[PDB]
Paper text:
For hGIIA, Gly21 can neither form the hydrogen bond nor clash with these compounds. For hGIIE, these compounds present 2–24 fold decreased inhibition effect against mutant N21G compared to the WT hGIIE. Our results on the co-crystal structure of hGIIE N21G mutant with compound 24 also confirm that the inhibitor binds much weaker to the mutant protein than the WT protein. Therefore, Asn21 in hGIIE is one critical residue contributed to the best effect of these indole analogues against hGIIE.
The mammalian family of secreted phospholipase A2 (sPLA2), which are Ca2+ dependent, low-molecular weight and disulfide-rich enzymes, plays key roles in many physiological functions and pathological processes by catalyzing the hydrolysis of phospholipids at the sn-2 position.
Numbering used by the authors: 3 to 123
Write the structure that this text describes.
Amino acid sequence: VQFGVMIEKMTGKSALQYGDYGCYCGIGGSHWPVDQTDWCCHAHDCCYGRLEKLGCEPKLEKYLFSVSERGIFCAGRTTCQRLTCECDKRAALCFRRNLGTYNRKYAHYPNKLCTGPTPPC
Ligand SMILES: Cc1c(C(=O)C(N)=O)c2c(OCC(=O)O)cccc2n1Cc1ccccc1C(F)(F)F
Ligand SMILES: [Ca+2]
Ligand SMILES: [Cl-]
Ligand SMILES: [Cl-]
Ligand SMILES: [Cl-]
Ligand SMILES: [Cl-]
Ligand SMILES: [Cl-]
Ligand code: NA
């Protein structure tokens, strides 16, 4: 809900249009990212991994945020909530920054088409 809301506010698209994009947007991921938007998702997965290693549960954490002219402001009772917001913010900004190359053909991309090596974090 929260990340999805952040995606919608920052990109003008439905959350669903990122949730299953390329080889990395959506649960898990493998092989080489298809484009810059997909790289945002690779980085976001790495970000969540770092949070998991710190003892957080970023897949489950609920946080608070606002969007003004100054940008995305993150908040939350716990440090783990705020960290999760920071990973999400970076991803949502990355999506916005790459709207110019977003390609509808990579939404709901068949995972069978993901080829090549898996880049490290
Ligand atoms: C873009 C994205 C994700 C990523 O950024 C990613 N790197 O995989 C993502 C996600 O990533 C965490 C993971 O890969 O384990 C899990 C579920 C939905 C996700 N979505 C889509 C999403 C996000 C919030 C609310 C709804 C949706 C959905 F799936 F409906 F589109
Ligand atoms: Ca992923
Ligand atoms: Cl690329
Ligand atoms: Cl990151
Ligand atoms: Cl707001
Ligand atoms: Cl910002
Ligand atoms: Cl397009
Ligand atoms: Na703390």
